[PDB]
Design a protein around this ligand. Structure first.
Ligand SMILES: Cc1cc2nc3c(=O)[nH]c(=O)nc-3n(C[C@H](O)[C@H](O)[C@H](O)COP(=O)(O)OP(=O)(O)OC[C@H]3O[C@@H](n4cnc5c(N)ncnc54)[C@H](O)[C@@H]3O)c2cc1C
Ligand SMILES: NC(=O)c1ccc[n+]([C@@H]2O[C@H](COP(=O)([O-])OP(=O)(O)OC[C@H]3O[C@@H](n4cnc5c(N)ncnc54)[C@H](OP(=O)(O)O)[C@@H]3O)[C@@H](O)[C@H]2O)c1
Length: 530
C-alpha cells in the first residue's frame, strides 16, 4: 500500500462537515502536511450516508452552511429554505472540489486503532486493512450522530422481505411503490420518511414506540431578505448567529411563558406554528419551555390542541399524543399529523403492542401479524460516543479510551481528552447543543490555533484531568436544571440498552460557550498544556 508507512503532520478522521473544514484549515490555510480519512467512498459524512426518503436539514440554509469561504457563504444558490440531503451533499462536494480536498483524503479507509507514541511524539494509526500511518496530531471528526443503531428482532431469518437501515440507506435505491412498508421510529428520521412515502407505498405501517411533539417545518423558498442582510455584513451575520444559544438563525426568547397573558401565549405559539421549525417553537417563543413543567405544558397543550383538530380518528389522535415533556431534540415536518388521516396509513403503538419477532411474511406486533414487504429502521444512533469508541484508542501509558469512557464520556470543551495528547475533536462530547457547521468552524479555528502554537515549540498539547472533570461537571449541572434531565432520549444515552445515561452536552449555548472558551484562551489556555 502506498498509504502504508505514510508520515503526516496531521491526520483528520472524517470527511463530513467537520473533517472537510479541519483538513482545509491545516492543509490549505496553515500549510501543514495533512490528509483526511473516511470509510465513505466520497465526502459528506451524514449527507453521504443518510440517503433515505425525505432526508432534509432542519436548520435554515442561511446558517447550515460554511462561512469560511465568504464567496460561497454569500453566493451559493441554495434552492430553498431547508436543503434536502442531495443538495447539501452537492454543496459539500463543491466545497471539496473548490479547495482541492479530495486529493488529500483517503476514502474507503476506516481507522481501526490509534496509539500514542510518547517517545516519538506521534500517533500511530492502523487502518482496517492493516496499514500504518503516523501523525503528530489527530483531528477526530467522526460525528456525534454517525454510529447507527437498530434493534435486531428474533427470527430475521424467517422474513422473506427486506429490512433497510435509514441511516445507511442502500446505494441502489429500493422500490417502495405499492408495497406494504413498515417504519420503525418517529424521531426526525421517521417523520421525514413517513411524510415522504405515505402517498407512494401500498400501505404504510408506522411502528411507533413513543410519539413526540411534532410541529410544522415551514418548507419554502430561500429567504432572500436574510441573504440581503448577510451581504451587508457577512462576518457580522456569522458572528450574530454564533452569539445566539442554538445558532439556528433566530434570537432565543427572553420572555417567560408564565409572565404573559393567555392571549399572548396563544398569539406567540400560533405565530411560531405558522412560521415553522422545531427549534424556533421550543426556543424563539418563550425562555422557559424546556425548564419548567408549567411552561412546558403551555407549549404541549398548544400542540395537543392542533393534533386533536387535525386527526380525524380520536383514538389515533390520542396515540399521537406524547406523555413525555417537550424535552427531546425538537422535531418538525410539514403535513405530519394529516398523514394519519390517509386510508393507507396505520399507526401502531409498539410500546403497548411490542414488536415481538419476525414472521415469514412480516412482523408480529402485540400478538397480531403485520404483513410487510419492507421494514425500514429509523431507529437513530449510538449517539455522542458511538464512533469514538469504535476506534481502539490508546493514550499515555497505554490507557484505553474504552476504559476512560466506561461510565460515560469525559472531555474538555468538546475538543480534547485528558491522557490523550495531541488528539483534538471537532464537536465532540460536551460541545454546545447548536447547529453544527458554523460551530465546527469556530472550534476548528480554536484547536488549529493551538496546534500552530504547539508547533512553535515542543509540539505537545495535553489537557488537564481537573479541567476536564470541571467542564463535565458544568455540563451535568446545566442539564440538571432542565427537563432534559428527566426525559430519556438519545441525548442522554437512554436509547441504547446498557449505555450509561448521563449528560453529554454543554447547555449554555454557543454565546456562553465562546465566552468560556475565550476566557480559557486568555488565561494562557487554562486547562491545556501547550
Ligand atoms: C438525518 C440527519 C439530519 C441532520 N440535520 C441537521 C440539521 O438540520 N442541523 C444541524 O446542525 N445538524 C444536523 N445533523 C447533524 C449532522 O450530523 C451534522 O450537521 C454534521 O453533518 C456532522 O458532521 P461531522 O463531520 O461532525 O460528522 P459526520 O457527518 O458524521 O462525518 C463523519 C465521517 O467520518 C466517518 N468515520 C467515522 N468513524 C470513522 C473511522 N474510524 N475511520 C474513518 N472514517 C470514519 C464517518 O463514517 C463519516 O462519514 C443531522 C444528522 C443526521 C444524521
Ligand atoms: N430533520 C433533521 O434535521 C434530522 C433528520 C433526521 C435526524 N436528525 C438528527 O438525528 C437525530 C436522531 O434522529 P433519528 O430520528 O434518526 O433517531 P431518534 O431521534 O433516536 O429516534 C429513533 C426512533 O426509533 C424508535 N426506536 C429506537 N429503538 C427502537 C426499538 N427497539 N424498538 C422500537 N422503536 C425504537 C425510537 O423510539 P423511542 O423514543 O421509544 O426510543 C424513535 O422513535 C435527530 O434528533 C436529529 O438530531 C435530524
Amino acid at each position: 500500500s502506498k498509504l502504508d508507512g505514510r508520515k503526516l503532520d496531521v491526520a483528520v478522521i472524517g470527511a463530513g462537515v467537520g473533517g472537510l473544514y479541519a483538513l482545509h484549515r491545516v492543509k490549505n490555510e496553515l500549510g501543514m502536511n495533512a490528509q483526511g480519512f473516511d470509510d465513505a467512498s466520497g465526502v459528506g459524512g451524514t449527507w453521504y450516508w443518510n440517503r433515505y426518503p425525505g432526508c432534509r436539514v432542519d436548520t435554515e440554509s442561511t446558517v447550515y452552511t460554511y462561512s469560511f469561504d465568504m464567496d460561497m457563504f454569500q453566493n451559493w444558490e441554495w434552492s430553498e429554505r431547508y436543503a434536502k440531503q442531495e443538495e447539501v451533499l452537492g454543496y459539500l462536494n463543491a466545497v471539496a472540489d473548490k479547495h482541492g480536498l479530495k486529493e488529500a483524503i483517503n476514502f474507503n479507509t476506516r481507522i481501526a486503532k490509534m496509539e500514542w507514541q510518547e517517545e516519538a511524539r506521534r500517533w500511530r494509526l492502523t487502518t482496517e486493512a492493516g496499514e500504518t500511518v503516523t501523525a503528530k496530531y489527530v483531528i477526530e471528526a467522526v460525528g456525534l450522530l454517525s454510529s447507527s443503531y437498530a434493534p435486531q428482532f428474533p427470527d430475521r431469518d424467517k422474513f422473506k422481505g427486506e429490512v433497510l437501515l435509514a441511516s445507511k440507506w442502500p446505494r441502489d435505491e429500493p422500490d417502495l411503490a405499492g408495497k406494504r412498508v413498515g417504519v420503525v421510529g418517529t424521531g426526525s428520521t421517521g417523520i421525514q420518511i413517513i411524510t415522504s412515502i405515505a402517498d407512494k407505498v401500498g400501505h404504510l405501517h408506522v411502528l411507533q414506540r413513543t410519539p413526540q411533539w411534532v410541529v410544522p417545518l415551514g418548507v419554502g423558498p430561500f429567504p432572500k431578505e436574510t441573504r440581503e442582510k448577510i451581504k451587508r455584513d457577512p462576518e457580522g451575520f456569522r458572528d450574530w448567529a454564533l452569539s445566539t444559544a442554538a445558532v439556528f438563525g433566530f434570537d432565543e426568547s427572553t420572555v417567560s411563558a408564565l409572565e404573559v397573558s393567555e392571549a399572548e401565549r396563544q398569539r406567540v405559539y400560533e405565530e411560531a406554528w405558522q412560521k415553522g421549525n422545531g427549534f424556533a417553537f421550543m426556543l424563539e417563543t418563550f425562555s422557559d419551555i424546556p425548564v419548567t413543567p408549567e411552561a412546558n405544558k403551555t407549549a404541549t397543550d398548544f400542540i395537543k390542541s392542533k393534533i386533536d383538530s387535525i386527526v380525524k380518528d380520536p383514538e389515533t389522535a390520542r396515540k399521537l399524543t406524547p406523555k413525555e415533556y417537550y424535552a427531546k431534540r425538537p422535531l418538525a415536518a410539514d403535513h405530519y399529523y394529516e398523514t394519519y388521516n390517509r386510508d393507507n396509513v396505520t399507526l401502531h403503538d409498539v410500546k403497548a403492542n411490542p414488536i415481538e419477532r419476525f414472521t415469514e411474511n412480516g412482523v408480529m406486533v402485540g400478538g397480531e401479524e403485520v404483513e410487510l414487504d419492507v421494514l425500514i429502521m429509523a431507529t437513530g444512533f449510538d449517539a455522542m460516543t458511538g464512533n469514538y469508541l469504535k476506534i481502539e484508542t490508546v493514550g499515555r501509558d497505554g490507557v484505553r479510551l474504552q476504559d476512560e469512557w466506561s461510565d460515560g464520556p469525559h472531555a474538555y470543551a468538546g475538543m480534547s481528552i485528558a491522557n490523550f495528547p495531541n488528539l483534538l475533536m471537532v464537536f465532540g462530547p460536551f460541545s454546545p447543543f447548536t447547529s453544527q457547521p458554523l460551530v465546527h468552524e469556530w472550534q476548528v479555528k480554536f484547536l488549529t490555533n493551538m496546534i500552530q502554537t504547539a508547533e512553535e515549540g515542543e509540539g505537545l498539547i495535553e489537557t488537564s484531568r481537573e479541567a476536564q472533570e470541571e467542564w463535565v461537571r458544568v455540563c451535568q449541572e446545566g442539564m440538571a436544571g432542565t427537563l432534559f434531565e428527566v426525559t430519556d432520549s438519545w441525548i442522554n444515552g437512554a436509547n441504547i440498552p446498557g449505555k450509561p445515561r448521563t449528560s453529554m452536552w454543554f447547555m449554555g449555548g454557543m454565546g456562553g460557550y465562546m465566552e468560556k472558551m475565550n476566557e480559557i484562551k486568555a488565561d494562557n489556555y487554562r486547562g491545556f498544556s501547550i
